[PDB]
Amino acid sequence: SEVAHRFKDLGEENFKALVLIAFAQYLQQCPFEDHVKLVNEVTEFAKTCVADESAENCDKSLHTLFGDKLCTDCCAKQEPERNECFLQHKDDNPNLPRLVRPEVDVMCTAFHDNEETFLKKYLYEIARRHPYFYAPELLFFAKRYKAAFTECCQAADKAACLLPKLDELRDEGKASSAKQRLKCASLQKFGERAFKAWAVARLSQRFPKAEFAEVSKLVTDLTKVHTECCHGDLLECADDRADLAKYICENQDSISSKLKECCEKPLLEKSHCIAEVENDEMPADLPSLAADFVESKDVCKNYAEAKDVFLGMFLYEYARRHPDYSVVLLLRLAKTYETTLEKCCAAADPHECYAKVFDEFKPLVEEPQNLIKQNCELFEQLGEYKFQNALLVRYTKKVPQVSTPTLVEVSRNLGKVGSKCCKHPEAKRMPCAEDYLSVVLNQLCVLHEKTPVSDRVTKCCTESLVNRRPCFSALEVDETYVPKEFNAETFTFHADICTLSEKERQIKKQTALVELVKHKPKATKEQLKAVMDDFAAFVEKCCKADDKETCFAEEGKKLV
Ligand SMILES: O=C(CO)[C@@H](O)[C@H](O)[C@H](O)CO
Ligand SMILES: OC[C@H]1O[C@](O)(CO)[C@@H](O)[C@@H]1O
Numbered sequence: 001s002e003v004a005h006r007f008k009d010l011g012e013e014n015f016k017a018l019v020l021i022a023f024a025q026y027l028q029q030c031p032f033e034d035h036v037k038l039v040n041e042v043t044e045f046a047k048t049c050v051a052d053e054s055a056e057n058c059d060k061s062l063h064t065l066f067g068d069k070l071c072t073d074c075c076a077k078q079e080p081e082r083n084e085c086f087l088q089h090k091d092d093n094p095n096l097p098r099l100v101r102p103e104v105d106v107m108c109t110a111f112h113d114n115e116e117t118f119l120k121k122y123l124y125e126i127a128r129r130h131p132y133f134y135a136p137e138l139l140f141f142a143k144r145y146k147a148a149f150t151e152c153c154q155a156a157d158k159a160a161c162l163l164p165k166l167d168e169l170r171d172e173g174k175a176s177s178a179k180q181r182l183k184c185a186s187l188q189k190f191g192e193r194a195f196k197a198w199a200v201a202r203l204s205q206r207f208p209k210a211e212f213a214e215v216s217k218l219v220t221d222l223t224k225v226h227t228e229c230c231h232g233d234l235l236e237c238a239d240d241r242a243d244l245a246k247y248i249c250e251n252q253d254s255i256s257s258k259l260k261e262c263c264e265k266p267l268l269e270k271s272h273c274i275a276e277v278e279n280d281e282m283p284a285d286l287p288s289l290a291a292d293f294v295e296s297k298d299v300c301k302n303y304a305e306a307k308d309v310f311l312g313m314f315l316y317e318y319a320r321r322h323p324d325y326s327v328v329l330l331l332r333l334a335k336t337y338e339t340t341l342e343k344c345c346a347a348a349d350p351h352e353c354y355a356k357v358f359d360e361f362k363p364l365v366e367e368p369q370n371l372i373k374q375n376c377e378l379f380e381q382l383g384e385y386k387f388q389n390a391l392l393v394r395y396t397k398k399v400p401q402v403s404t405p406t407l408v409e410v411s412r413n414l415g416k417v418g419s420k421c422c423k424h425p426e427a428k429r430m431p432c433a434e435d436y437l438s439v440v441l442n443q444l445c446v447l448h449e450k451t452p453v454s455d456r457v458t459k460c461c462t463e464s465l466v467n468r469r470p471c472f473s474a475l476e477v478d479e480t481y482v483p484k485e486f487n488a489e490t491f492t493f494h495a496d497i498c499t500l501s502e503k504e505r506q507i508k509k510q511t512a513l514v515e516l517v518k519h520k521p522k523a524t525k526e527q528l529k530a531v532m533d534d535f536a537a538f539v540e541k542c543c544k545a546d547d548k549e550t551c552f553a554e555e556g557k558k559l560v
Helices: 002-010 012-026 032-051 062-070 081-088 104-113 116-128 135-150 158-206 212-230 234-250 267-274 290-295 299-305 307-320 327-345 350-354 362-380 384-398 404-422 426-449 455-462 468-474 495-499 502-519 525-542 548-557
Strands: none
Touching (some): 012 234, 032 062, 135 234, 158 212, 327 350, 327 426, 362 404, 455 468
């Protein structure tokens, strides 16, 4: 019996949780206490099965069991095609109430009142709004969300304690979800082989002192974890994730010397810890690569005789000595090498055709290097908010078809890179910057995917996950684009704008900026600053009273 096996390793409180999440992800439109009920039957059923293995129906796969409960289009359909239906029905941008957080006291009132139903409503709300969210990490966000309600409601002021701590959570939230979203699309749209290469590369940076047979082992385990998570098999996902942790913590003199403190922590924490560890110090006296990947006579023998292992060794030896290269770059480097080997071994003097191989990395390394210096400067010379507006006009010009909210959301998150990365010392700038940019570009990739409107985006999104960034960078303004038709149903206003949070306040402006730029695809910096400055002036007026509602209306209409 599978269920039971999972109920035992995971324990109940986790089990109950992981099943809840899976139901929220499977059915994002369905009511809360409909799902809690479904979770309850299953848990109680899994107890009968935990008792007697033979108990009727306990031999059934998790898919059959979860699918049946769910069904109490996709249901008039049987396993395995049925499960594929739920998975294929997942929605990255679901029509659901923004999640406004009401008066704190009331949150402490519901928390101390009913504390199981209050953590279960948090899982349920994150999960249906983030249908690909790394299941085990959620549990960890839930532990912390409690620790915060527990340790603020019993304090002087509960607004000053809680809110910051809870804001720090929502942030880590977003970022973790976007990171997991990108692993799932690597597997789903591009297949295991690409993910494994990504893994080989990243782990090898983290664990440079570790050997290739050790990195491979961790790579199969890691990909197995994610395969299941991204496929919605959360229970096995959590189980196998815990096991990787038990494993890393036992062999940590074979893997890295940075695990001490992570591996003394409780299960939920250690995994989260391990996944964030600092790169270990790269080994002492390391032979340049050329040795066996260029100088050798068996070069072409080995690539023919064992390509995957061989190209595995390369990426690994190259990665372990470039913690200052982004994973994307190294993956490009790796592809450029296999491709070269491809032509050279086919020709009359292979050793000669391929000895210039390392000399085709030059331009590939250069491109990201400059781009990261240029805008890391523009941003010290501009600041985040002003940096975001610049990205916002650039990317709108590139792909003006994409929806405003997507444009605003992506571009702002693109701005968060200067802030996040440009502080770092140059040998950390690049993996930060570029590895961060892939996550936010994938967001755009998956947000646009629900309803494609721009073939320039569709193309860069399907061509190669690795090339995705350069593909976006190299785009220039869209001169085919039919300039947009000015609409009064826009710069219509809303005396609310006077009382918006600083965030919401910047978000309305940026949203107006997009519109603007979409109205004149070709327009100066100097004419946008002009038209924007007008709008700002108009708003500062009407936010000073008598009749704000009519002020906004007259000037709305007196711009009509
Ligand atoms: O690069 C790092 C190290 O901070 C992490 O972002 C890592 O890539 C992630 O934990 C695995 O998905
Ligand atoms: O994302 C990769 C990292 O996450 C873990 O698999 C645990 O989830 C660690 O083994 C690995 O270092």
